[PDB]
Amino acid sequence: CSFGIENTAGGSAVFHNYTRGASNSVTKNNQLLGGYGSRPWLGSTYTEHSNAALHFLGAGDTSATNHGGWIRLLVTPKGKTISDRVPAFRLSDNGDLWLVPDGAMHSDLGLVRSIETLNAAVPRFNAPSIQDGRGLKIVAPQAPEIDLIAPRGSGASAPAIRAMWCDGSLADTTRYIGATQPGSTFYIGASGHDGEKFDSMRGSVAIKSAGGWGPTSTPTQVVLETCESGSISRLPRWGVDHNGTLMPMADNRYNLGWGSGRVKQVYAVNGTINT
Amino acid sequence: ECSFGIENTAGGSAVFHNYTRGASNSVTKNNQLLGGYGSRPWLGSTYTEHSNAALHFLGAGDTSATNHGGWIRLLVTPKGKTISDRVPAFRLSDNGDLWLVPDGAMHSDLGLVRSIETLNAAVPRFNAPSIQDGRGLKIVAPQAPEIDLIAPRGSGASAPAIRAMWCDGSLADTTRYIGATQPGSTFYIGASGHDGEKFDSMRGSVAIKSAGGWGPTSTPTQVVLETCESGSISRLPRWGVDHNGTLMPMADNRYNLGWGSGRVKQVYAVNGTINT
Amino acid sequence: SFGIENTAGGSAVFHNYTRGASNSVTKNNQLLGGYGSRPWLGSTYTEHSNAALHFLGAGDTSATNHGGWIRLLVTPKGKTISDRVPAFRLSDNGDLWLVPDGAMHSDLGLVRSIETLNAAVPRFNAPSIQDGRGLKIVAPQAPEIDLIAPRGSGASAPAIRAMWCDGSLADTTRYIGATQPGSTFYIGASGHDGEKFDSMRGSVAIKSAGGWGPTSTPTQVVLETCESGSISRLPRWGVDHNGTLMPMADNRYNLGWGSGRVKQVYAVNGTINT
């Protein structure tokens, strides 16, 4: 049944995996520094390796200036053998969470942990490594997806994606937090490979501060951005301003409607267009 | 102060294994607890009966020569409750999805739910599309499941973002071709829902689309808004912003701007004459 | 390798036991147990683990509180275990907090909820009603979700999908039912006003426009802003269920302004209806 560690003076009771390089050399980048793992029973044996596991791995060859390490969790899909086990959860040394379900990456890329390393293993990728350390990366064939499942019970189904702007920083000892600043933005939009590389988003919805905030003024706008055919510049086209004006984001430039997609009728209180 | 270390001094790996069988040396079972690691904390003179925080390995499918199926969950216990009401709030499915199921969200009878497939099974009136399994992150919370993106300025700019990353090709094979964003690339943000029989497709959305295949000096996009009419179950594009920035209706002679009791106040345009 | 076995096909589990000082009850955020790689420098191991799973107490333990939570620690390439990062926190309430390098000081290593973050950083004041709602990502400046969507043989179709229903999975009954009216899916921005975070002040929302049934599932899409000098987020412009693009109030919101005019308007009727 059970197997314990105890610490009766109320110190902590911890388990450690120790591991070296070949010939007492320093441990290596992506070397498996330790692991915990179910092996299940086939009938008369156990599986050769674990079918579900927590792995600790090195990030960089270890040294006096690098104790780099990262984590991953491995699962095995119903109806496959541990040959096709999947390191689906990767907690990068930088702290990003990569989520890589079955189908998404070949097991030769099992040790990919960052955009930097993905760029290395797949030289045609070329995604912006400045995006490393920014949080959650999901990789799935075709249709990577977030599902927000929202039973009413007794109130309201209100799933939400909520950006939270503030001034200041939680990274230092000071820990000033302060009022939302101008040029605060919340972009939802699409980057993509142009055949050379990924770069900046080229179509977006953005929610922006339109102003610095204080406790009785919190202006926002909502802006829609596209990129023109033959361009690589994402441009604001239409926004809703803080006063609720729907507008083009530049004067004398963008139509409403076109010849083969005309508005059916316009309702405005003033019957005269103001030019 | 009291450490317990496995060591491998030739620089092999040093791993820990949980071994587990079925009854009477039978093959291990679906959702059978194949192993576990777990804090038990001290009440005053005893430990809790089970762990209050734990990593569990579980079987997915009865084990066999063609099924080594396994999955993971992490259990926590909320402040002010006993381990009776401990919560398997992190579930890493055998398909590789992450399910995130906080306190309040699922009854503990559904502690072993690991996919839309199994959720449909346990809750027969659910009927959600199991084709969505394997797609990444599922969050389940009563009423208000939520992603919070907390964005301190420090010295630059509060710029939280949700960023789709379109490409051609695949990371799943050995070739590993990656290539230019294709046409009919999309990034949909929208709402599915139960119709009283089932969940199905989204019925209102914002989408960012490729409007074109891409290359390094042309990366066209559009943004499109979709709704479903009362009495219909068809989600339809209504208004978009095109790659040239035209705000338009997504069909000719069909959608109004304004209505009788919600009129625009004034229109500003350079041409004072509507083109018909 | 080091294996525990259970040959009668009971379960084979590993337990960390831990007490308070002098056989006292274990404490809030006390490290109740752990598993941790220590790697080899050349002639020694690192002093603590460079990657680890920690179990911690939530609340002083008691007959009515067995509170516990989990975190995973990593160490970034080119730094020592001094600057290791508890980047994954699974709160006692069940939320997942994701806190990469650069995001929080190590003094806030034990932060596990908005409640406890408010405590450690008294100027924060974020709404603790948001605890238990799922995923919180904290990064300096640019917290981000990336959805990476290789075509292979079909279509690049990344998606963020709200799933409305009636009923509840929390009880034993487990009624699930049709999407109700005032169902919403908001994507938008809260922020500090200099006192506190509160509700979102600009948003896109997808709404139910109606209760649903198996032949009618109406939606609208609505854009909300807040005016300069206000703290009220207000619907401004929506796309209705019939596809009408409208202002969300009569005689109130312009299309265009004097220094940002539409270039041309195309409509079938050449006469504005007033």
Residue numbers in the entry:
A (entry chain B): 989 to 1263
B (entry chain C): 988 to 1263
C (entry chain A): 990 to 1263
Provide passages from the article that reported this PDB entry.
The well-studied Siphovirus T5 has a three-fold symmetric tail-tube, to the end of which three long, L-shaped fibres are attached. These fibres are made up of a homotrimer of protein pb1 (pb stands for “protein band”). The L-shaped tail fibres are responsible for the initial recognition of certain Escherichia coli (E. coli) host strains, binding to the O8- or O9-type O-antigen of the bacterial lipopolysaccharide (LPS). The bacteriophage T5 L-shaped tail fibre uses an intra-molecular chaperone to fold, which is then auto-proteolytically released to yield the mature protein.
A dataset to 2.5 Å resolution of the seleno-methionine derivative of pb1(970–1263) collected at the selenium peak was used as input for the phasing procedure. Fifteen selenium atoms were located as expected; the asymmetric unit of the crystal contains one trimer, and each pb1(970–1263) monomer has five methionine residues. After solvent flattening, an initial model was produced by automatic tracing, which was improved manually. When the monomers in the pb1(970–1263) structure are superposed, they align with a root mean square difference (r.m.s.d.) of only 0.3 Å over 269 Cα-atoms; even loop residues superpose very well. The structure of pb1(970–1263) resembles a bullet. In the mature, chaperone-free structure, the third interdigitated region does not contain any regular beta-structure, although there are many inter-chain main-chain hydrogen bonds. In the mature fibre, we do not observe density for the catalytic Ser1264, suggesting that this residue is removed with the intramolecular chaperone domain upon maturation of the fibre. More than 90% inhibition was measured when T5oad was incubated with pb1(970–1263) at concentrations ranging from 0.015 to 1.5 μM of the trimeric proteins, while pb1(970–1396) does not significantly inhibit T5oad adsorption at the same concentrations. These data indicate that the pb1(970–1263) domain likely binds to the O-antigen receptor. An attractive hypothesis would be a receptor-binding site in the groove that becomes exposed upon intra-molecular chaperone cleavage, and this is consistent with the results of the phage infection inhibition assays by competition with pb1(970–1263) but not by the chaperone-containing pb1(970–1396).
